[PDB]
Amino acid sequence: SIINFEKLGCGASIQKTPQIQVYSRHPPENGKPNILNCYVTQFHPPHIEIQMLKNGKKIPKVEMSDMSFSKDWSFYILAHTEFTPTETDTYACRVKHASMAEPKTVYWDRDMGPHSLRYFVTAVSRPGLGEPRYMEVGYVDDTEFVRFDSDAENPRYEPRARWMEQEGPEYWERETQAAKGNEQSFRVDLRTLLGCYNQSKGGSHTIQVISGCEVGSDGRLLRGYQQYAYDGCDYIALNEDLKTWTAADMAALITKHKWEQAGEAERLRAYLEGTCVEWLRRYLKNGNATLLRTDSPKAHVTHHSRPEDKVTLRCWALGFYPADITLTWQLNGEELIQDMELVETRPAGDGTFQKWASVVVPLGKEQYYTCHVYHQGLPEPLTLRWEP
C-alpha cells in the first residue's frame, strides 16, 4: 500500500543518452521463428521513439513493454517483435530521443533473507498534449505486483501478478482513490516547480519518487526510502536516520524547511516502520509460491574469428533470475578483468535475463582460458571452457 504523498510546495504559483542492445530471445537459427529484442536503457526524458527495421523498412507490429526507471532515475524499456531470421536478412533498431541530434540506428549483430516493498512513481507533464501522465508501480523484491496508470478513461490499480488477485474489492478501491489523490498532488507540484526552477511554461518535465521499506528476516526495518527527483536529478531524500532530509539544491531547501515544520519525517517513519512493513508481510504471504523462486543460469562458450592470429571467446549466461550475476574470464587462475568485454545484463523477454563476457585470446590457446559464472541460484560457481 503506497503512502499518501505530501506536496513538495517549492514555491507559490539535463538529458541522458539512451543505450541500445539488439538481440534475439533465443539462439538464432535460420527458418525457426524467434523474438527480436530492442533494449533501451539509461535515457531521460522518458519520451522516446523506437522503431525496429527489416532491411531498412519499418516493422509494423512491434510490441513495447511498460516503461520503468532505475535507482539512478534513468528510464528503460523493452521493444520486441516476432521474426524468423534468415541468412541475409538485416535487422536493426532505430531510436529517436531528445538527447541526440539524429536518430541512432543499432544493427542486430548475430554473434553466435531481507525483502523490500517499493513504489516507483512518475509524473510527466505534457503541455498542449493533455493532462500529465501519472504512474504508480509497486514492487515486492524487484517483482512488479501492482500498477496504476492515469492514461485511461477509468484508471484503477491493477494486479500485475496472479497472487494479487486474492485481495478483495475494498483493497483495490482504497488504493485507486489513493492514487488519484496522489496524482493531484503531483499535478500541482509540476505547476509550481516550473517557477522554482525558472523554466518556460511549454516544456515537459518529470517528477520521480521511490518510496518503500526493506525489511530483514526478523521483521525489522533495514532501510526506509522516500526519495524525490525532478527532471532526472536528485531533489530531496529522507535520510537513513528517518529523521532529517537531504535537499539536493536550493529549490528543495524550501521543501525541506516546510516538511520540517510540518513534521513530515515523523509521518514517513510511522508509515515505513508500520504500514509498509505490515503490507510487505501480507504481500509476501500471498505470493509465497513464486516470489522466492530463482532460476540458475545455463552457460556455454562460443568461438569467433578475429584479424590475424586472434580469436574471441564469448561466455554466455542464459535463462537466469534474478538479474544479479558475475562473469569472469581466467588465465592461469588469475582473472582478466582488465581486458574483458561485457554487455549489460538484459531481459530475454520471458522473465529471465541474459549476459555475456568475452576475451580476445591467441589462436590455438583457447584451452588455456576458463569462464566463471557466479549466481545466487547456483550451488557452486560454474566453470567451463570452449568445446570445439
Residue numbers in the entry: 1 to 13, 24 to 122, 143 to 418
Sentences from the paper on this structure:
Based on an examination of the native structure of the SIINFEKL (SL8)/Kb pMHC I complex, and the structure of the single-chain SL8-β2m-Kb HC trimer, we introduced alanine substitutions at residues 63, 66, and 167 in the MHC I HC which interact with the bound peptide in the A-pocket. Positions Glu63 and Lys66 interact directly with S(P1) and I(P2) of SL8, whereas Trp167 caps off the N terminus amino group of the peptide. Similarly, the hydrogen bond between the backbone carbonyl group of I(P2) and the side chain amine of Lys66, present in WT-, E63A-, and Trp167-SCT, is not present in K66A-SCT. The space created by the shorter Ala66 side chain is occupied by two water molecules, one of which is stabilized by a hydrogen bond with the carbonyl group of I(P2). Interestingly, the side chain of N(P4) adopted similar orientation in K66A-SCT, whereas two alternative rotamer states of the N(P4) side chain were resolved in W167A-SCT. Expression of WT (*002) ERAP1 (25) in SCT transfected HeLa E1KO resulted in a significant decrease in the levels of all A-pocket variants detected by 25-D1.16 (∼35–40%). By contrast, the SCT variants exhibited higher RMSD values of 1.7–1.8 ± 0.2–0.3 Å, a first indication of the effect of the mutated residues on the conformational dynamics of the antigen-binding groove. All three SCT variants displayed lower free energy barriers of dissociation with respect to the WT-SCT and in the order of 3–8 kcal/mol.
Major histocompatibility complex class I (MHC I)3 molecules present a diverse array of antigenic peptides, the so-called immunopeptidome, to circulating cytotoxic T lymphocytes. Here, endoplasmic reticulum aminopeptidase 1 (ERAP1) and ERAP2 trim peptides to the optimal length for stable MHC I binding in the final editing step of the antigen processing pathway. The construct consists of SL8 peptide linked with β2m and Kb HC in which the C terminus of SL8 is tethered to the Kb-binding groove through a disulfide bond between Y84C of Kb and a second cysteine within the peptide-β2m linker.
